[PDB]
Every structure is written in structure tokens, then in C-alpha cells.
Amino acid sequence: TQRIASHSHVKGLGLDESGLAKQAASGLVGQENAREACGVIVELIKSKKMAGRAVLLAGPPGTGKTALALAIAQELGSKVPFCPMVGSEVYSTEIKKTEVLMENFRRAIGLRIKETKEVYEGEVTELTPCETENPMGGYGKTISHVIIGLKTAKGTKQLKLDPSIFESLQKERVEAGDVIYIEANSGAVKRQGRCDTYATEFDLEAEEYVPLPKGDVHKKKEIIQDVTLHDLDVANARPQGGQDILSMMGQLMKPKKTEITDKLRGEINKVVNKYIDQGIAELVPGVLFVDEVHMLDIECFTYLHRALESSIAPIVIFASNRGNCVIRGTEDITSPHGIPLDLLDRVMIIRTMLYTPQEMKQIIKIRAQTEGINISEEALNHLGEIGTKTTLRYSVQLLTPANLLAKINGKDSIEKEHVEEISELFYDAKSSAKILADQQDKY
């Protein structure tokens, strides 16, 4: 079964139909105004009206801003792209900072486009070039068509084909008892190998045999294929399927990202609009979640001023835990949240708040019953108390090690005497710093 992580319980925002928050629902507890706010943002993303609008979740360490951002992705579900990033990802060795941001802005926009596939396949039982009764004038013989007899686990039938197929059927080393396929939209033929039926005809042969096709000789299906605009950017900027020196040299060489030009972005925008107009393809504008924003550089922020104002951009969600820090890439310029004031003017802030002693107790129970652990009430009333003296993360951190110690001492549930033993093994940030300060001459 799947492993457990620091957000595995977050299943949604947990709202009424009226859009008011519930005290505890879909794995979340508390933060009601911030959850109500994210409710509005989910409707904004589902509306498909808007571009470039952005929100900053602001609040101290361990208050739920990452959890809430993840919850929005649950409300939207799998069909619309949600792209996570951290501020520290922009500093690549291959490519400039502003290109990393621009790629991510194009990852968070999807196409869904749908098309038929048709193919013929089977073991070839016969190749029967068919002559006309008389040749054309002056000629010795004339062939009107080839018959190919294909068989599969479901049956057998003849296909009748244009004489020009015959050249291809000797470029490929096709012989009777091979299995082949023909792409019905293109007319090309490809060999797969000798059928598995014949695997016994020598003690050794230097070919891998392939099993007989199952289902009909002629196959059809409709499939829906989904791609980001960033995938179209890259596939056009470095082509594939080389039969030329430029391609093959380019494919033996070490691949590296490159600064994709604004012309290519332009041309891709022009053609996907033609397909959207013709009803061939559906756009799904998505979300970019830039976490840990306070790690971006002032050059990056000053690029975002242009990026967020573009008519194309996705919805952007930002997060930060900083107070009045200096902006990276400047010497002295302090600002709220570690962000420039003139970017912070372009975002709606959502504010996130510390938990009360009752709320922590309620979350620790939700962790235990998802991490697969049983706890007695007299132990939980100790662990929520430790949480109040220390931090939510540390009081949640003790659950699994307490369970392990309980199991080694032969019990099926955490008890008081377990948690007050684990607390003696592992310090926290607050208590460790005290130990350093009493001993500062020895580090």
C-alpha cells in the first residue's frame, strides 16, 4: 500500500453549499476565513474567465498555507493542470532565471485534444498479387491489386490493396508467418516479427517471436490526449525522428535547455487558436503554485510584474513565512513578507493564523488515524499539551516513534508512559537552542 506523507490527509476545503466553512471536514480543521477565501479562488479558477490574477498565502511557520494550497488542487481534481514549484528552482545552470519562470507559466496551461486511431494487424498467411484478364496494350502483364490474408485470435480475412504496397513488402523483410501492422491513416506497413506459433521450428533462432494479435484484424478507437503548451514549445524547439545529420548529431550530443524565442510562443498560440475555433481541442487554464516565494531574486520579481499582466497567464498562488526581511539581490531593502511593495500591490493577500490548544488536539487525532495508530485519551491529552508548549509539527512528529516503542514493549496503542519516554529521546528547536547557548564555547 501507498506510503504516508506530511499532507496525506488533506482531501478538500470542506465547505457547505453556501460556501461557509465547516469546523472539521475533508481532513482540514479551523482557519475558516482562509478556507472560505480559498473557496472563492477555486470558483475563480473554475470560471475560465481570467488570466494572471494572483494570491499570496501569508502567515507564520506551520499554520497551514501549504495544506490549503494542496487542498485547492483536490477541489479542482486531476483534469486541470496544477504545477508546483519552489522559489529556489529558478537558479538553473543551463538557462536564465526569467526563462525558468516563463516555462512554468506555460506548464500551467493545458490542451485536451481528441482523435481516432485505426490500424490493421495480424499474421500474414498469403501474399497474392492478382493479374487482370488482359494486360494493357503492349504490356506483358498488369496487376490490379494485391491480396493479403491476415489472421488473429478472433478470425481471418483478406485485405485488398494497391499494387504499390508490394515495394514496401520487400523493403521490410516480410515473409509468410510474420505478424505485421498497417496504419490506416497513412498506408505504411511495418513488420513486428515471426509469430510465436513457429518458436519450435529450430533449437535456436536469432529472432524474438511475438504472440498472435487478439481481437479483430481491423481496429478503431477514439482517444483523448492532453498536453501542456510547454510540451508544444519544447517539441517544436528541438525536433525528433531524425534521418539527417542535423538531427542525429543533435541526438548524440548532450541535450540542454535553451532560451525558447518569443516568436515560437507566438506561432504556437496562433495555431492552437485555429483548432479551438474549429472545435477540435479544448483549453484548460490551470494553476501555478510558486511555493517559498521569498527565495526569488529582485530580477525575478521585476519580471513577474510583466508576466502576471499578460492576457495568457495562469492563476498564480504564492506563499511566504517571512516578516520584514531584506529582498534577495539588494543590499539593504527591507520589505513585508520578503517581497517588493510594487509586486505586493498586485496580489490579493489571504492571511493564515496560529492554532489554539483544542485545534492542535483535533489535528493530532486526524494524523494518528491516518498514519494507522491507536492512542488512549490520557496520552492524547499529553501530546496536545506538548504541542501547545512547542509546535504542531514536533507534537505530530512523535506519533510514529511512540507507536514503535509501544510495539517493542508489546502494546497495540500509545499510552502516557510512551510519549513521556519519546520526549526524553528527541529534543525540539526551542530546547536544542537552549543547550547550545549554555555551551557556546564548544561548537
Partner: protein
């Protein structure tokens, strides 16, 4: 008009340096040991790959069993130089179309009551919607990669 055309005098190397001076030649006896003590010798690949002692026991070259590659092909590709690479690449392009048909229609049910990876099962790159085989197979995505 046509550009100005020029040749310098050719760079002269003495017999003494052409006979006694290339490290490629004068150290050829020593160099052979570095190819003998190679982990890429097909001897060592077989012994590493199939003749282990633990049930679980990590060994390199285990990936060779899930790409299409044999020990002789791998040793060749490590020692013969860039021509081997070019020919191996050319064959790999031809092979990818065949893998795509099998992977995209032949998908239903496990071959084994659901055990075992097959040969070629780490070659994932064909699965992408915009891979050359798929983009050749589907007539319409071909127009979005222009």
C-alpha cells in the same frame, strides 16, 4: 565574385616524434591493462548479472535486463568509439515504432498472472503523447509540431 582563397604551409612533424613521441603508441602495452581490468568486459557483466550469491543482492548492469542491451553490445559500445554509437542509435529509431504499436494496442491483461517486467520495460519515452511514433500514428498532432 568569390571569397579570397588561402592555404598555409602544412604543419611539420619529425620522424622522431612520429615514431617515439605518441603516448598512444609508446604506452600501448600499459594501456591494454586498463581495458583488461574494465568492469565492462562481458566476462564480468555475466558474472555480476546472473551468478550472484544473495537472493537480494544489488548489482550494476541490472538495468541492462530492462533496456534491450546485451553484455557484448554494452562492451562494444564502451570501447569501439563514436561509430558504434551512431549505428546503435540508427537501429534504436527503427525499433521504437515496433514498441509503440505493442505498447498502445496490445495493452490489456498481464502476461504472467501479474508478475515480471518484460524486456524493454524501462523504455518509457514512447508513451509521451507527442513522441515521434505517436505523432506519426495520429494524423492531427503532426500539425502542432511543425
Amino acid at each position: 565574385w568569390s571569397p579570397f582563397h588561402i592555404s598555409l604551409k602544412p604543419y611539420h612533424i619529425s620522424k622522431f616524434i612520429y615514431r617515439h613521441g605518441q603516448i598512444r603508441v609508446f604506452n600501448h602495452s600499459r594501456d591494454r591493462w586498463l581495458r583488461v581490468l574494465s568492469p565492462f568486459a562481458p566476462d564480468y557483466i555475466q558474472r555480476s548479472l546472473f551468478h550472484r550469491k544473495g537472493i537480494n543482492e544489488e548489482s550494476c548492469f541490472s538495468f541492462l535486463r530492462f533496456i534491450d542491451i546485451s553484455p557484448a553490445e554494452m562492451a562494444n559500445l564502451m570501447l569501439q568509439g563514436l561509430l558504434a554509437r551512431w549505428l546503435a542509435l540508427f537501429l534504436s529509431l527503427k525499433a521504437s515504432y515496433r514498441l509503440h504499436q505493442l505498447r498502445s494496442w496490445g495493452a490489456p491483461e498481464g502476461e504472467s498472472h501479474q508478475r515480471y517486467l518484460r524486456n524493454k520495460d524501462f523504455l518509457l519515452g514512447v508513451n509521451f503523447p507527442l513522441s515521434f511514433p505517436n505523432l506519426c500514428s495520429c494524423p492531427l498532432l503532426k500539425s502542432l509540431v511543425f
